[PDB]
Amino acid sequence: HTDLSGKVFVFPRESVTDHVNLITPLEKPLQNFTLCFRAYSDLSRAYSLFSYNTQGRDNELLVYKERVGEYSLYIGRHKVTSKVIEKFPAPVHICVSWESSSGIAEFWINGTPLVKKGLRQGYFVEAQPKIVLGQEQDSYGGKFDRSQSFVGEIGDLYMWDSVLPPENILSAYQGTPLPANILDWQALNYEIRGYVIIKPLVWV
Amino acid sequence: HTDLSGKVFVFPRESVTDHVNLITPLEKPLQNFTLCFRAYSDLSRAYSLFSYNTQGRDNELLVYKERVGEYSLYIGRHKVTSKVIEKFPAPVHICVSWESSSGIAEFWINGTPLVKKGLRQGYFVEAQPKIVLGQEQDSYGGKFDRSQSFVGEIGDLYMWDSVLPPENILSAYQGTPLPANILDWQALNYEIRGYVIIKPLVWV
Amino acid sequence: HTDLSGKVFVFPRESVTDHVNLITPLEKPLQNFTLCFRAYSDLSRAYSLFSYNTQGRDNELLVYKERVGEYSLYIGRHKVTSKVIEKFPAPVHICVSWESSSGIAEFWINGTPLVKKGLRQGYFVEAQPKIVLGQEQDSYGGKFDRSQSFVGEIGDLYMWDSVLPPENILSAYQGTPLPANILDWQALNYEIRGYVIIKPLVWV
Amino acid sequence: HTDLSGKVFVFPRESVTDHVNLITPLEKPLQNFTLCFRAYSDLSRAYSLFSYNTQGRDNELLVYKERVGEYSLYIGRHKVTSKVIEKFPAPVHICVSWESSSGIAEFWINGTPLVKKGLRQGYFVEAQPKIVLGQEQDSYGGKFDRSQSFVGEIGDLYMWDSVLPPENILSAYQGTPLPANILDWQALNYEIRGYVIIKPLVWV
Amino acid sequence: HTDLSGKVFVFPRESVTDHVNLITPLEKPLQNFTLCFRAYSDLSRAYSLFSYNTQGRDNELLVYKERVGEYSLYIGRHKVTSKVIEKFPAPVHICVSWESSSGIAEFWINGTPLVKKGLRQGYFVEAQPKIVLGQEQDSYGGKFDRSQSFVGEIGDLYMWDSVLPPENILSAYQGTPLPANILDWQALNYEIRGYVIIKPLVWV
Ligand SMILES: [Ca+2]
Ligand SMILES: [Ca+2]
Ligand SMILES: [Ca+2]
Ligand SMILES: [Ca+2]
Ligand SMILES: [Ca+2]
Ligand SMILES: [Ca+2]
Ligand SMILES: [Ca+2]
Ligand SMILES: [Ca+2]
Ligand SMILES: [Ca+2]
Ligand SMILES: [Ca+2]
């Protein structure tokens, strides 16, 4: 695993091939989680930010930007969306969390909580996933779609198997996240497939 | 007598079912009142904020958001509307007061007074009401309407039987409201029906 | 007379009836005046702010709002209009002076001078007026029109029989005006007709 | 030879008659010049700011406002235009210099240089002009067009027979211009024709 | 061999004729480079900023403005585009760098990094070029197109054969660039063709 501190992955072009696989030893179904990352894209169409599919299950966990000012979260093929005021183009810091017990999804955009939404109360996002950055999956590992691909830069990705309270979200936003135990930018196991480059993070 | 301070009700989805009943043994008609609460919603359509119906009387006392920037208050099926410059989406603090002798209705949005309007001078809003949050009543406890439903977060809801002066409006807005006698967020009696969750107030 | 310091007239609804008659023993024709007052309305339509008619003369002195950012002044049925940048809805402090010898009308809106316009050079606005607030006269004391009626709040109304220099405009603006001889909010003689209420001025 | 220090001219209404003739014993052709003045108008339509015609030559030197954010300069009937961000309505300080040898025209708006443009390299602006304020000339001293009329206030008009450095533009803008030798607000020879008043300058 | 510190090239008119040839004795092909300059123009149409052509190859290296907020880079006839929030009209400081090994193109507008794009990885941009300012070349030295001409001012043009780190971009934006070895505004070799004047830089 690699230390990607002060670095980002830049997907420099639109394609249906370019993507990087994120590898975690996830054995037990997710009950809770929080996923934070930074992104910088000047795409005005919709795209996938983070895809997570399991054997025979599409959009098990998907974080999707519909358009400017609105973000969607998919849990077990059901989705929820929340709006926010934001500049275009501009770098963005995103956290989203979800708990199975209340069904509540929480988005934070640049430190700022959006309205809470709920979906899939009492569900478990299954284990042994295929997580990819740069493309939206429609099979376990594949069936990409050029019109949902992400082109730009992603950095500082962390994923925890708990719902973080606001002070921890805020730490991540401001550059000091707690060590994450599902995905950690500072000890990341990834595969680059296609044309993606690691360049220093110069937009924060 | 449940102390909900630091907490909100979240209506996580749209429906004609989810709602909470606020219970108060109000037996004597209202001549004067002030009602304050916070809300957080990214609905663009019209929605009911606070629905107070009595036996055989619709919209006995209703706070309604028409659209961004525009609030309505119904007293005894009569309605007055006032505008304010507003950001969307954004959390809001709302007080409204009414007094029978003058008929004057006073809106205070995030500490700013809207233009006074007047209605129902000399009228007394009936007692023994059925107060619902999340849905808009068209009967005495029911006849809900999906497109007037409220999905978002409501907290810090206080109802007094007098018209509060500006400094007490400001105190409520600031987070130190005077104890209330009709409805008090710190000693509230309610019933949750459907899918509504109590979460901490993270957006203030 | 009555001291209205710290109070405002609330015209709480649209009507063809509610209005207030300002009384001044004005016996000499006016060659110079300035008129200052504060107003708070969320009306989008055109409205009359201050209507001054004499025997056989309509619109002898009319201060009229065409639309947001557009104020008009009528002198002996003649009219000029001047534009300002302004927010809607917002409280506004207005002064306007008019000089017979030059014909020049000055508007000051929240302390800012508008572009000077000119009308009726050498005219004298006739005495013994009927002055009304809340409605636009078409006769000597009446002939109101619902669609030019004022809904909202007026206060801190003063009228001088001279043209005030800028510094006396700013004083009025910041809350310490020169005692007026034609109309003074702190020594006012008025009749309320219809639904109009007096309330503390909570928005300045 | 009137000191108009602290005064402006105010064209209080739209007409085809009102104007001021500016008088100068300009008996040799211009190779370079700088023209500065302040203006306050709420006209949305196009309008002449400064009209300089010679015998048999229309639009010899004309400073024309096309619309908000767009100023034009005519030199010997050739036109050039530069844009700027500006508020409306609002007072503006304007300065335009032209240089025969290069053809370079520079606009400064409220101290801000616009993009330089070029016209009529090698040309000399003919002497013995008629210069009018308030109308646009199509003939030597006349043929005005009401839809090009200036309604508003002008003052602090100075004209030099050299191109001023930015230092001296900044100084003019700040209220201390260099003594001018074609046209000088503090030693101005003019004829008022029609309805134009002189009033103190209250908006800078 | 001229030192243009505090000076600028102004293209005052639209045409298909006026341009400046920059001469650089570039013998090797380029793998890395950085090109910075300031430009001030109020064209709303597309225009070429910097045109670099070689024997038989169109758009070997072209910086092109598509419309307000949109900048294009051509390397060997492939093209990438990146967007920024931008005021119009207003001066701008542009840097762009490109790296063969990764294909990564970096735009920096007013010291702010745009989203990275990638093109032509493994490619070497050809030497012995013909570089022109004001026009967009379509042959080696010529075939100019009036609707891509640049009319405005360009100054402080530096070209390095390395990829500058953000520190050196900023110091170049802030008025103290590193000495440049492919093009250097302080030791520039150029030819003027047509109407293009040299004047002091006043908009910085
Ligand atoms: Ca999918
Ligand atoms: Ca798909
Ligand atoms: Ca109802
Ligand atoms: Ca209903
Ligand atoms: Ca009338
Ligand atoms: Ca009328
Ligand atoms: Ca003409
Ligand atoms: Ca004309
Ligand atoms: Ca080309
Ligand atoms: Ca071309």
Side-chain angles (χ1 to χ4, degrees):
Chain A
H1 65 233
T2 308
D3 182 19
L4 253 23
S5 283
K7 282 171 182 42
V8 295
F9 288 130
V10 6
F11 302 76
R13 58 167 199 210
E14 190 173 80
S15 82
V16 73
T17 51
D18 302 336
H19 72 286
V20 349
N21 297 312
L22 257 40
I23 307 175
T24 175
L26 215 35
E27 82 174 289
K28 220 271 309 273
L30 247 6
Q31 197 168 66
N32 316 330
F33 78 83
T34 311
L35 163 70
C36 314
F37 51 95
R38 304 202 197 279
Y40 190 24
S41 173
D42 52 15
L43 238 43
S44 46
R45 57 149 169 100
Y47 49 89
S48 196
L49 253 346
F50 193 90
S51 178
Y52 175 116
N53 282 17
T54 53
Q55 12 148 333
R57 264 143 114 206
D58 197 24
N59 299 328
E60 189 60 9
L61 147 47
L62 169 58
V63 179
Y64 196 79
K65 186 156 193 215
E66 302 289 353
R67 51 176 65 68
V68 159
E70 69 183 76
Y71 297 86
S72 299
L73 172 69
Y74 290 72
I75 293 315
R77 287 153 291 304
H78 295 195
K79 82 144 156 205
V80 118
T81 307
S82 285
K83 301 174 190 119
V84 63
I85 291 168
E86 64 170 17
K87 299 195 188 187
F88 177 74
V92 76
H93 191 261
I94 307 168
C95 312
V96 62
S97 66
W98 187 76
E99 0 170 87
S100 172
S101 43
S102 57
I104 292 307
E106 241 185 74
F107 275 104
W108 298 71
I109 309 289
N110 298 333
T112 282
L114 311 198
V115 181
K116 289 170 176 77
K117 303 293 155 60
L119 70 168
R120 296 240 66 152
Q121 191 177 32
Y123 186 71
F124 295 92
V125 355
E126 262 265 87
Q128 303 219 132
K130 295 291 241 185
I131 306 167
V132 331
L133 253 42
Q135 303 284 344
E136 206 285 316
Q137 292 173 86
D138 266 355
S139 53
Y140 190 58
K143 275 174 67 190
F144 301 148
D145 177 351
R146 193 251 263 103
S147 71
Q148 301 181 301
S149 71
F150 173 82
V151 8
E153 324 180 27
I154 300 185
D156 289 349
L157 196 145
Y158 295 89
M159 191 175 177
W160 294 266
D161 77 330
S162 58
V163 179
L164 266 41
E167 324 82 31
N168 287 342
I169 306 270
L170 210 85
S171 314
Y173 169 51
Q174 292 168 343
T176 58
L178 290 181
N181 55 348
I182 291 180
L183 262 17
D184 199 289
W185 197 245
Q186 282 182 111
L188 203 58
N189 290 328
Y190 61 89
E191 300 167 326
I192 283 175
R193 293 287 180 273
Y195 184 32
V196 13
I197 310 300
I198 291 155
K199 275 269 173 228
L201 168 66
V202 303
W203 31 277
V204 176
Chain B
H1 195 74
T2 300
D3 178 0
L4 254 2
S5 50
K7 286 205 240 305
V8 288
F9 294 129
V10 20
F11 302 86
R13 45 145 185 179
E14 188 178 281
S15 84
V16 77
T17 247
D18 310 339
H19 71 281
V20 359
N21 300 329
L22 264 16
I23 286 139
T24 189
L26 192 51
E27 281 177 317
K28 206 179 265 131
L30 278 182
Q31 206 181 319
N32 311 309
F33 72 86
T34 308
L35 172 66
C36 311
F37 49 91
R38 296 186 201 274
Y40 194 13
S41 183
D42 55 17
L43 246 27
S44 263
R45 59 160 172 88
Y47 51 87
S48 173
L49 263 338
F50 180 102
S51 175
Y52 179 126
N53 267 31
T54 56
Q55 233 142 171
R57 282 164 128 177
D58 195 34
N59 287 356
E60 188 64 9
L61 157 51
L62 172 59
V63 179
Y64 201 83
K65 201 185 173 156
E66 301 284 357
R67 67 177 53 80
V68 164
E70 180 167 325
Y71 294 86
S72 285
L73 168 75
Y74 295 61
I75 302 285
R77 272 150 309 298
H78 291 227
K79 141 209 230 181
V80 285
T81 305
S82 280
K83 307 172 200 287
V84 66
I85 289 158
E86 188 166 84
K87 293 166 180 290
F88 177 78
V92 74
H93 188 250
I94 301 177
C95 301
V96 60
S97 67
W98 178 74
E99 57 163 29
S100 176
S101 62
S102 61
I104 289 297
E106 221 176 88
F107 278 98
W108 294 77
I109 304 306
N110 295 340
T112 290
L114 299 202
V115 176
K116 291 167 185 62
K117 303 290 163 73
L119 69 168
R120 302 240 74 164
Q121 181 180 38
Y123 184 84
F124 297 98
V125 2
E126 260 293 63
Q128 257 147 260
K130 226 146 204 166
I131 302 172
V132 326
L133 240 43
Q135 300 285 334
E136 206 284 316
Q137 299 175 85
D138 264 1
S139 69
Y140 189 50
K143 274 203 307 295
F144 304 146
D145 188 331
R146 197 182 197 60
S147 54
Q148 303 180 303
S149 77
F150 174 81
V151 13
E153 299 165 54
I154 307 170
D156 284 344
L157 155 6
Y158 294 92
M159 193 170 178
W160 292 271
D161 67 359
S162 50
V163 174
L164 258 51
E167 296 288 20
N168 287 2
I169 304 300
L170 252 64
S171 293
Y173 171 52
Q174 283 170 19
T176 61
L178 269 63
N181 33 27
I182 301 175
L183 244 31
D184 198 289
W185 198 240
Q186 279 160 76
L188 201 70
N189 186 35
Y190 59 88
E191 306 184 321
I192 273 156
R193 302 302 185 249
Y195 181 38
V196 7
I197 302 294
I198 303 163
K199 284 281 170 192
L201 196 249
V202 302
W203 31 272
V204 189
Chain C
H1 46 248
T2 333
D3 184 359
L4 253 19
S5 291
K7 303 165 191 277
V8 101
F9 289 129
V10 186
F11 302 83
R13 55 160 194 215
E14 187 175 286
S15 82
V16 78
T17 249
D18 311 331
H19 70 281
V20 178
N21 307 309
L22 274 4
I23 294 133
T24 189
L26 190 44
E27 209 95 89
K28 207 159 37 87
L30 249 7
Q31 292 167 31
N32 308 329
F33 66 90
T34 103
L35 173 65
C36 313
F37 57 89
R38 272 185 224 280
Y40 191 17
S41 179
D42 61 9
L43 243 23
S44 316
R45 59 168 168 74
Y47 51 86
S48 179
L49 285 158
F50 179 95
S51 179
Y52 171 127
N53 271 22
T54 58
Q55 290 175 261
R57 321 283 256 314
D58 184 34
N59 291 353
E60 182 73 4
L61 171 28
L62 178 47
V63 175
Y64 195 72
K65 198 183 176 169
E66 305 289 346
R67 50 179 54 84
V68 171
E70 234 168 83
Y71 292 94
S72 287
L73 169 80
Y74 291 73
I75 296 294
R77 269 144 320 284
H78 293 194
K79 146 206 234 189
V80 281
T81 304
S82 275
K83 289 168 193 146
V84 66
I85 302 177
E86 72 177 18
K87 283 186 217 303
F88 178 77
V92 73
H93 187 254
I94 306 168
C95 298
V96 58
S97 68
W98 176 80
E99 241 204 8
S100 170
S101 50
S102 57
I104 291 312
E106 291 182 20
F107 280 99
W108 297 68
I109 302 290
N110 297 318
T112 292
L114 310 195
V115 174
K116 279 167 185 69
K117 309 288 170 73
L119 76 165
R120 308 238 75 170
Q121 186 178 34
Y123 187 82
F124 287 38
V125 329
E126 251 308 80
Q128 298 184 244
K130 237 69 187 293
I131 304 162
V132 309
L133 247 37
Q135 301 283 344
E136 212 274 319
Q137 291 170 90
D138 274 348
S139 75
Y140 183 58
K143 250 151 138 300
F144 298 146
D145 171 352
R146 173 184 283 252
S147 79
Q148 305 173 300
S149 73
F150 178 85
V151 189
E153 300 178 39
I154 301 195
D156 293 357
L157 185 316
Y158 299 90
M159 197 173 176
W160 293 267
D161 74 332
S162 57
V163 181
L164 253 52
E167 22 287 336
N168 292 347
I169 304 282
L170 297 191
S171 305
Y173 177 53
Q174 315 163 7
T176 65
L178 241 70
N181 40 2
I182 296 197
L183 250 26
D184 193 289
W185 201 244
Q186 309 171 36
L188 197 78
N189 298 283
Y190 64 84
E191 318 162 344
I192 289 169
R193 293 284 190 270
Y195 193 30
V196 4
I197 302 290
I198 293 170
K199 286 297 199 184
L201 167 75
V202 299
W203 37 266
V204 173
Chain D
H1 194 299
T2 308
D3 192 354
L4 262 1
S5 280
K7 308 138 48 242
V8 288
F9 286 132
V10 17
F11 313 84
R13 52 125 196 249
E14 196 182 80
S15 79
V16 75
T17 27
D18 307 322
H19 61 282
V20 178
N21 306 334
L22 258 33
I23 299 285
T24 180
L26 196 36
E27 309 195 301
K28 83 260 117 110
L30 260 18
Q31 299 173 40
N32 354 270
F33 77 79
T34 305
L35 173 62
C36 309
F37 51 87
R38 301 193 203 270
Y40 197 15
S41 184
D42 61 9
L43 254 17
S44 334
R45 60 150 171 93
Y47 54 81
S48 189
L49 280 161
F50 189 88
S51 189
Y52 180 122
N53 270 27
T54 55
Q55 178 172 70
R57 271 138 120 141
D58 190 29
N59 290 357
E60 187 58 4
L61 170 39
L62 164 71
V63 180
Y64 197 76
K65 177 142 194 213
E66 298 292 350
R67 62 179 54 74
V68 176
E70 257 184 79
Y71 298 87
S72 288
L73 166 83
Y74 283 76
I75 296 278
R77 270 144 316 287
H78 290 190
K79 169 199 236 164
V80 122
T81 310
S82 285
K83 310 184 188 149
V84 60
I85 304 153
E86 69 181 14
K87 288 128 201 82
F88 168 84
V92 69
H93 186 259
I94 293 166
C95 278
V96 66
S97 68
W98 181 74
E99 196 173 275
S100 182
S101 47
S102 69
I104 295 306
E106 37 181 90
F107 280 99
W108 304 65
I109 300 301
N110 298 321
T112 301
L114 307 197
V115 174
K116 290 175 192 59
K117 300 289 165 72
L119 70 178
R120 305 240 50 164
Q121 197 170 9
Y123 190 62
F124 290 176
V125 19
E126 283 273 77
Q128 286 186 305
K130 288 197 169 300
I131 302 168
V132 352
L133 253 35
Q135 307 289 337
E136 215 278 317
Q137 302 174 76
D138 272 346
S139 60
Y140 192 49
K143 252 145 86 193
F144 302 144
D145 174 357
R146 174 187 279 263
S147 67
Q148 296 190 317
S149 58
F150 184 68
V151 183
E153 311 172 39
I154 305 199
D156 295 343
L157 175 356
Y158 294 87
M159 184 166 172
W160 300 265
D161 62 353
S162 67
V163 180
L164 262 36
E167 195 85 28
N168 294 313
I169 313 287
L170 187 50
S171 202
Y173 174 50
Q174 284 193 355
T176 305
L178 209 69
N181 55 355
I182 301 185
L183 248 18
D184 185 334
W185 200 239
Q186 290 170 298
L188 198 73
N189 195 357
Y190 62 95
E191 313 173 349
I192 291 169
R193 295 278 173 267
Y195 179 33
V196 8
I197 306 307
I198 289 162
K199 276 284 169 206
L201 179 57
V202 322
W203 38 266
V204 103
Chain E
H1 200 314
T2 317
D3 180 1
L4 263 29
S5 298
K7 257 72 150 310
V8 94
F9 285 138
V10 23
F11 303 87
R13 54 170 207 199
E14 171 170 295
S15 87
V16 60
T17 287
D18 316 325
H19 64 289
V20 179
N21 297 317
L22 279 8
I23 304 162
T24 185
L26 208 24
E27 339 193 275
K28 286 210 121 175
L30 254 10
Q31 281 157 80
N32 303 316
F33 82 84
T34 301
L35 161 79
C36 311
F37 53 93
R38 309 178 191 280
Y40 190 19
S41 163
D42 51 25
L43 282 337
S44 45
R45 68 158 159 78
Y47 52 91
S48 172
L49 257 350
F50 184 87
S51 191
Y52 187 112
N53 271 19
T54 56
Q55 278 161 31
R57 305 189 95 56
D58 190 21
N59 298 347
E60 191 59 11
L61 156 51
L62 174 65
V63 189
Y64 192 73
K65 182 136 193 229
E66 309 285 339
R67 63 197 111 248
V68 173
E70 290 201 28
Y71 293 88
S72 284
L73 184 57
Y74 294 78
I75 299 292
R77 280 148 308 294
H78 295 212
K79 178 170 81 156
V80 294
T81 303
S82 278
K83 301 167 184 148
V84 53
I85 295 150
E86 177 171 274
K87 289 168 342 78
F88 173 86
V92 72
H93 182 260
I94 302 160
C95 305
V96 60
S97 69
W98 177 79
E99 200 177 64
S100 182
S101 47
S102 64
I104 292 307
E106 279 209 328
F107 273 112
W108 293 74
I109 305 295
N110 286 329
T112 293
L114 317 196
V115 186
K116 278 173 250 274
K117 309 302 162 69
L119 74 166
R120 301 230 72 154
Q121 169 176 49
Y123 191 72
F124 296 44
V125 343
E126 265 288 52
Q128 259 146 189
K130 232 147 196 36
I131 298 149
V132 310
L133 259 29
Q135 302 286 338
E136 209 280 312
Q137 300 170 76
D138 259 358
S139 48
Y140 186 56
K143 286 170 94 177
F144 303 145
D145 181 351
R146 187 181 250 249
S147 43
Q148 299 180 321
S149 61
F150 173 85
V151 20
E153 308 171 46
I154 276 170
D156 279 350
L157 182 337
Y158 295 90
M159 194 170 199
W160 294 270
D161 67 341
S162 43
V163 177
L164 256 41
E167 305 105 64
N168 294 332
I169 283 151
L170 285 185
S171 58
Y173 172 43
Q174 286 155 31
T176 42
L178 278 199
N181 51 350
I182 300 176
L183 265 354
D184 184 63
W185 198 249
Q186 286 161 63
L188 209 69
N189 208 4
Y190 62 89
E191 299 155 352
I192 289 176
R193 311 266 105 109
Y195 187 26
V196 2
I197 301 294
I198 297 157
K199 285 270 180 210
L201 175 49
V202 291
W203 40 270
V204 159

